[model samples]
Target chain A: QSLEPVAFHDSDECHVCGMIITDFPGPKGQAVEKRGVKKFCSTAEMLGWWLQPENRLLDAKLYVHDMGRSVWEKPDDGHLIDATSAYYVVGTSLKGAMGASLASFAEEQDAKALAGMHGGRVLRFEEIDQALLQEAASMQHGG
Target chain B: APQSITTLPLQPDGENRWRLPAGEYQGQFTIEQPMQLRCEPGAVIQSQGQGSSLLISAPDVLVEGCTLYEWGSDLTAMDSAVFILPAAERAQISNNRMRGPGFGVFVDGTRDVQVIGNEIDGDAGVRSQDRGNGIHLFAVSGARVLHNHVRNARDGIYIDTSNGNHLEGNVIEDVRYGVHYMFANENSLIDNVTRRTRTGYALMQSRKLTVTGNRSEQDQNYGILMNYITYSTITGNFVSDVQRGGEGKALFIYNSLFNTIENNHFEKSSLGIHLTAGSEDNRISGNAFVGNQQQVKYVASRTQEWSVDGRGNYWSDYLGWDRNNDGLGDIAYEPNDNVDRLLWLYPQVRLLMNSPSIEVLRWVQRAFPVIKSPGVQDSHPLMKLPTEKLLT
Candidate 1:
């Protein structure tokens, strides 16, 4: 079977945080491997697993929800953009399915506009590294 | 000409169209061609003696809005009220009520069939033995079984070697297995409820199946039993009260590999999760175990972690605290210790489970923390339940 857009069903919980996707829908991410797709509640949790050294060699296709016109109840109800090409507004004031979310957008201009409204820094996929991950980890633990 | 009935005759209205008006038809009927059997509202169809009430041998058949009563009499186990043969491809059996003394809806060797919005009452009465399945599918593919209520049968829904089927919004109770399947791959079961059954949901030799948002409660055996199931996802289900005498596991996984069990609730069971027969490479995470007699029971004496990436299930017995308030325990919670592992091997030692000797053994192990055996642990046990809706 070919790779299709991740469809969130009623009982789908986050593969990372284990929260029900329907409970809080913003900023969902998914990794498609040889077996199947592993869905996450937020982009941060997906990055936590994707950026690991051991899993870096897995030929996994990564995708994140484009929250341009998405609702909080159905965040990925919009288009699912490739995480590698998408622009992310990190450290946004808006909370995600898990905690602090990486509000992603298909266009950089859309990302910049969201950052202007939500108080965060817009960055590309390559700009996010371990230091930003450390910050997200700390924020996740309420530090 | 079709067999005449006392109340109403099976007559054709237009091309390939048959209609049974609102009356009680006391006989058998067979459709041997591409046709539509439209029963008026409150139309009742019955069999004279009940070997097979209605047999469809044609493709593209549709039966809608009829009440089938006493279709199968004292026949063998291999009988049904509505039997669709291999030639009946793309058949639609919808919105019909069936009261059965035998099988309900039996579809075999067909493809792309839809069984929707039907109520099957297997009136086995006091003894539910020798009763056929409510909905039996064999060698089928690309079928949609939706919004059916089945009760008092051998199996509420039985799928055999069926591939790429979608079973959703079903309420199955008082059966042997609410949903039983073998060699069925790539199937999806969503928002179904199975209660008071032998095994709530049992799947064997299946791969890549998705089971989500289902509830299985008060099962005499396992709430969810998987044997040789691989590459499957079992998520967000509420399984509880599996109180069989021998092995009442909320989730009994045997010889299953690479399956994902996540975000489910297991409460008030003999054992919350039981893994045996070399079940490996499986991910169990983000679940809740509340008031279970034993949280987990594994056959091997090897220790395995049940968490993924700093996230694990919530245990009601976990005493550890999350100092950072990150919703995870600061210390890892070992669900089973050496004593518990020993009791798994020697069930006689379970007599002393609540005794003072076992209590001291547990206390010493907690205080000193030595001699770890092979058991399951949650590295990131959740501080609280995942959702408030789970409490209900």
Candidate 2:
């Protein structure tokens, strides 16, 4: 019996399992910090972290921007709300600057994203922060 | 005279040139003859690894712009994209994407070939045995390896007993070993980046090589290493962020001779310059070892060669004042081992250094010249970088 080679396009968007990915926000939003601790949406830090070695990133907080959006919401009281959310995919590097498209995903259902979404999502909106987007953009880049 | 893209049970005599029609074909395909496996970009043949996705043992083969993926519950040992073996010449495997498998594309004993522009991603939880290389050249020669990105792999690229190869412009990361060359010779690695690897590069018993304009970072050990190698030039490279003392060295030469180490930057590593036993007469000049925990460390072995000249390097912590202002320090400077021992204990202390203990150790290293047998010292060091570009 003989086998053959399979090919994929470099710039082509990944074809999921017939799954629709709507509301695909660029993940370049500012953080909602409370009382000095990092509250939510670390697009900048994630970029720098991805540039670090994988072993070094073992202790890092792997974020899930998509899950953070779908699950968490900012209430009128200014406190973060927790909801039933699961991370479909974890984040890595920012995309705009890196300029390489990789259709890849990790197998594990990221628990950190769920935790971040539940009372961990930072709340600020309406301000387009380059620092935040740069981080999320970096996360889009491969590690 | 029919056109079809079939499944795992590929027809043996169906067609020599076949296209994998759009869709995911899961299962294994065994190849009996030399076949031209073509695919429209965006078509993926993900192998469940019942056997290798594609195994090529025929006389003539061309697998261009293809993706080979391995996934699922099967024991991980049985996964390979394409295995090209002896007498299979002119195998052009270019611009392909490959994922985790036992071996992504093992091409052995082939000549007059081009292996170029492939992206190999080793996903998480990929075991070492399951991990594959972008290109494994064993006992083959006259090949060009260019523009490949390999990550999360056990080993990125392995060239064993191969020669006259051009390895250029490749981004290899997060693997066990970026490039492993054993008895491979006359190769050129230009404009390459090897970072976030367990072991950066290993050259054993290889000669007549030129490695230039490469950036290596975040390695667990030796960025550019030559063991039992001879007649190589290690030039124009920058190595940084090496962690773990035993593993992190910018350049480590052992049982190697007639090698030129020039115009390279060694930064933030345990030992920037390391020379072990049986490494003889290696000239290390015009190189910059800045802010490394141990700028230079030498271990003399019986088979090792003699005194490597450590001259004209800009050490970040060289305190020797130039009395004559000859653009060089009038006094000799030697690297300290006390900090290295502390570094071995707590790896974080390497950054919080350039203090009195290092200075005292430097003085002791120079004045006493060890006060012991065959002492170690960083002779003719610059108190500061002679060139400003070398600083940060």
Q: Find the candidate with the highest TM-score and give its number.
A: 1
Shares of reference contacts reproduced by the candidates, in order, are 0.00, 0.00
> What TM-score against the true fold does each predicted structure earn?
0.70, 0.59
Off by over 4 Å in 2: A1-143, B1-21, B30-38, B58-61, B71-79, B245-247, B299-311, B321-329, B336-392
Looking at model 2, residue B110 earns an lDDT score of 84
TM-score of chain A of each: 0.86, 0.21
Q: Poorest 10 consecutive residues of model 1 chain B by lDDT? A: B1-10
- Lowest summed lDDT over 10 consecutive residues: which window, candidate 1 chain A? A134-143
TM-score of chain B of 2: 0.78
Task: Give each prediction's root-mean-square deviation over alpha carbons.
Answer: 17.1, 18.8
State, as a TM-score between 0 and 1, how close model 2 is to the true structure.
0.59
